[PDB]
Design a protein around this nucleic acid. Structure first.
Ligand SMILES: [Mg+2]
Ligand SMILES: [Mg+2]
Ligand SMILES: [Mg+2]
Ligand SMILES: [Mg+2]
Ligand SMILES: [Mg+2]
Ligand SMILES: [Mg+2]
Ligand SMILES: [Mg+2]
Ligand SMILES: [Mg+2]
Ligand SMILES: [Mg+2]
Ligand SMILES: [Mg+2]
Ligand SMILES: [Mg+2]
Ligand SMILES: [Mg+2]
Ligand SMILES: [Mg+2]
Ligand SMILES: [Mg+2]
Ligand SMILES: [Mg+2]
Ligand SMILES: [Mg+2]
Ligand SMILES: [Mg+2]
Ligand SMILES: [Mg+2]
Ligand SMILES: [Mg+2]
Ligand SMILES: [Mg+2]
Ligand SMILES: [Mg+2]
Ligand SMILES: [Mg+2]
Ligand SMILES: [Mg+2]
Ligand SMILES: [Mg+2]
Ligand SMILES: [Mg+2]
Ligand SMILES: [Mg+2]
Ligand SMILES: [Mg+2]
Ligand SMILES: [Mg+2]
Ligand SMILES: [Mg+2]
Ligand SMILES: [Mg+2]
Ligand SMILES: [Mg+2]
Ligand SMILES: [Mg+2]
Ligand SMILES: [Mg+2]
Lengths: 88, 218, 129, 18
RNA sequence: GUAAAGCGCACGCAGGCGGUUUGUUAAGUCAGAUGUGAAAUCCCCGGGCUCAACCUGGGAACUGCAUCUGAUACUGGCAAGCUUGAGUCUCGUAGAGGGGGGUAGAAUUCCAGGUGUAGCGGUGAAAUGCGUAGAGAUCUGGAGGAAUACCGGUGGCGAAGGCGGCCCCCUGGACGAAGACUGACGCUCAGGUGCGAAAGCGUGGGGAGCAAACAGGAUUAGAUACCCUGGUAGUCCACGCCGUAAACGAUGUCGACUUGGAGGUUGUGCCCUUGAGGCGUGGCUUCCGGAGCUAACGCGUUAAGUCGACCGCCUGGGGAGUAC
């Protein structure tokens, strides 16, 4: 799991204020950071099906959150994706 | 300390969910029945019993309990009514024709004993026959008086004697039963949140109902 | 519940009636309040009350004339995924008029008799008998 | 098989204990 | 669930459905009006054949479509909201959850040495087999592969298949206390994608024990068949393929409501935790049983009870899950 310091840094960098962990942008940032961290582990192992299932679950959650954010506000979504470099 | 305020209660741990409002709660690890809210319904039952006795109904008593056998027999003899001191025979009400045949046979044997059985034919065989029939004579002490057809019942328990309640319900005979705190109150239409232990309490209850019925004829 | 609050409240009423419960509680809503008012107006229930503002809760008091339940049957008619609409000239009749069918017309929620009298069709919420 | 006897023994779990 | 029928399991696109307030939009829906819906035929009230069939006048009907005018409770679209659904953050808890690398003890087999000497092994009884070039037994070293006794439990974890020595590294999920945050972001899913016991296949290793095939012994007039002695794949590893099970709880996933007892296993709050205890409050799980349900068996708050959303599947037995 992501370290406490990493989560705090992500919240500070993305949250609009303190204790803004529930914002969609913060959730997307945490999910993408975890996905990036786990990519190397999966490449190293490539046989952890159970962990791959958890990775797929978080990827699906991030996609759903991104779709909801795009529907609610185009500007926020288009800024978040370029900041995080998603949606190639 | 009223009449119902003396007994402590029953139903230590296991309870019947049907009679939820009839229990005050759990006190000193043992549930207590709604003693305060017990006297009105009992009075109503007594009034109904008095109404039944207005026509001199054939209200029966069940004495299946050995400890309470004499406790209910005294009330039965005081009211000169029918009672069942021994085990309640299955089908007494539903199969009353068999009981009628049995009591008719008993009456015929009793009438003919003084003439034929004594010394007309034999004595040893007659003595053995009389010894065998003494238990039958003892059984059905009160129910053998008239043709039966009871209009009510006063069984002292429900779970133990559910057969009588079921028979009465099948025949549509109201039952003024003192349902136990862990019995099934569905069968009894006049459920009385009383107690089964504390022989003194049940003795007081039967004495009170006997007194009420005695003066119920006006 | 998560997809049919009306069916959920109808089910709650049926279960409470079968369980011999004095009253039942559920989340409150405008349509639920209107249905409860219509049911009370016809005597199917004793009374209904709403408690709270942020998270309103609707409480309905069941009625028992005798040992048997007054609400013999209650069945949802129009449900999500299959909507039922009837014209004023073909409104449903429950138990040859002995029952009550809830109809939502342009004038609000009312019994089938009221809708027929007003000559307005609508959506058949449910049958109550 | 070397596994069937184990299953047979485990079948007696409900004999008289529960 | 057992009569035919729940995909082996999961993720998820299209699609179907979707918590609670308002605002107006009037698409669905509803009300009225108008135009049309050929005549004949069906139906109702009548008439003419002496009655009937048959013919015929007027209606009704043609359940439909289109346009206009209105109502808008409900559903839908648009704009704001709300926190109960669903999620994020903080602390802590148990776990054979998964991947990788180490290491430990017992045991089997083999190799070699010492002591020792005729049997050992096997069976219902035998024989094949091993042994004087010294077996088996006992001891003492070494090599190797495979699996983890006791704990161990109607115990625990995992979506399913499945997961048992100990330690380390990486990693997934679930649960509990108290808060803060986002504000419907949800449910289900045809196709699609992924996972998926054992056996099997391709390449290259490994091979102790087990063991299809096979060899021999015994039995029989001769066989086959169990039985015995051996024994090759296979079983193990790395990669790739196979995608099948009585893959079962013969019970699809999600949410709500509905009498109760007896446990097991993990949390957590309070009372002298004095402690094991009592009082409560959660998650998972086993058994009995009420209403209700069921053809009965039986299920029974973990429903096969009362409902709602969506998906899959079945409608005689054989042919046949076979042919093309
Ligand atoms: Mg963890
Ligand atoms: Mg079948
Ligand atoms: Mg299944
Ligand atoms: Mg799914
Ligand atoms: Mg979809
Ligand atoms: Mg929609
Ligand atoms: Mg809605
Ligand atoms: Mg319209
Ligand atoms: Mg119209
Ligand atoms: Mg026409
Ligand atoms: Mg609206
Ligand atoms: Mg593990
Ligand atoms: Mg872990
Ligand atoms: Mg490996
Ligand atoms: Mg060794
Ligand atoms: Mg589990
Ligand atoms: Mg807010
Ligand atoms: Mg599919
Ligand atoms: Mg294999
Ligand atoms: Mg082959
Ligand atoms: Mg191979
Ligand atoms: Mg090979
Ligand atoms: Mg052979
Ligand atoms: Mg063999
Ligand atoms: Mg062998
Ligand atoms: Mg299959
Ligand atoms: Mg299995
Ligand atoms: Mg199946
Ligand atoms: Mg059977
Ligand atoms: Mg059961
Ligand atoms: Mg069934
Ligand atoms: Mg057929
Ligand atoms: Mg085929």
């Amino acid at each position: 799991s992501l370290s406490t310091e990493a989560t705090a840094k992500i919240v500070s960098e993305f949250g609009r204020d303190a204790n803004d962990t529930g914002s969609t942008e913060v959730q997307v940032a945490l999910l993408t950071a975890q996905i990036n961290h786990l990519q190397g582990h999966f490449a190293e192992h490539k046989k952890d099906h159970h962990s791959r299932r958890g990775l797929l679950r978080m990827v699906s959650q991030r996609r759903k959150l991104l779709d909801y954010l795009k529907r609610k506000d185009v500007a926020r979504y288009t800024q978040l994706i370029e900041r995080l470099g998603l949606r190639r | 300390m009223l009449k119902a305020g003396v007994h402590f209660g029953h139903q230590t741990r296991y309870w019947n969910p049907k009679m939820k409002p009839f229990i005050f709660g759990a006190r000193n690890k043992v549930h207590i029945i709604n003693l305060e809210k017990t006297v009105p319904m009992f009075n109503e039952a007594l009034a109904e019993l008095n109404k039944i006795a207005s026509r001199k109904g054939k209200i029966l008593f069940v004495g299946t309990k050995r400890a309470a056998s004499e406790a209910v027999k005294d009330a039965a003899l005081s009211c000169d009514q029918f009672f069942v001191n021994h085990r309640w025979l299955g089908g007494m009400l539903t199969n009353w024709k068999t009981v009628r045949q049995s009591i008719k046979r008993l009456k015929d044997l009793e009438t003919q004993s003084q003439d034929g059985t004594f010394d007309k034919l034999t004595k040893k065989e007659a003595l053995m026959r009389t010894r065998e029939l003494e238990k039958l004579e003892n059984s059905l002490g009160g129910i053998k008086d008239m043709g039966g057809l009871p209009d009510a019942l006063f069984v002292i328990d429900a779970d133990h004697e559910h057969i009588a309640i079921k028979e009465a319900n099948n025949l549509g005979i109201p039952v003024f039963a003192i349902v136990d705190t862990n019995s099934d109150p569905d069968g009894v239409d006049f459920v009385i949140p009383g107690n089964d232990d504390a022989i003194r309490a049940v003795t007081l209850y039967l004495g009170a109902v006997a007194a009420t019925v005695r003066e119920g004829r006006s | 519940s998560m997809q049919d609050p009306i069916a959920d409240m109808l089910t709650r009423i049926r279960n409470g009636q079968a369980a011999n419960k004095a009253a039942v509680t559920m989340p409150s809503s405008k349509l639920k309040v209107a249905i409860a008012n219509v049911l009370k107006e016809e005597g199917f229930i004793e009374d209904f009350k709403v408690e709270g503002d942020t998270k309103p809760e609707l409480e309905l008091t069941l009625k028992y004339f005798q040992g048997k339940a007054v609400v013999e049957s209650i069945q949802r008619v129009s449900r999500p995924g299959l909507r039922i609409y009837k014209r004023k000239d073909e409104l449903p009749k429950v138990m040859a008029g002995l029952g009550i069918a809830v109809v939502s017309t342009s004038k609000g929620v009312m019994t089938d008799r009221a809708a027929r009298q007003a000559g307005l069709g609508g959506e058949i919420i449910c049958y109550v008998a | 098989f070397y596994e069937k006897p184990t299953t047979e023994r485990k079948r007696a779990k409900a004999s008289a204990v529960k």
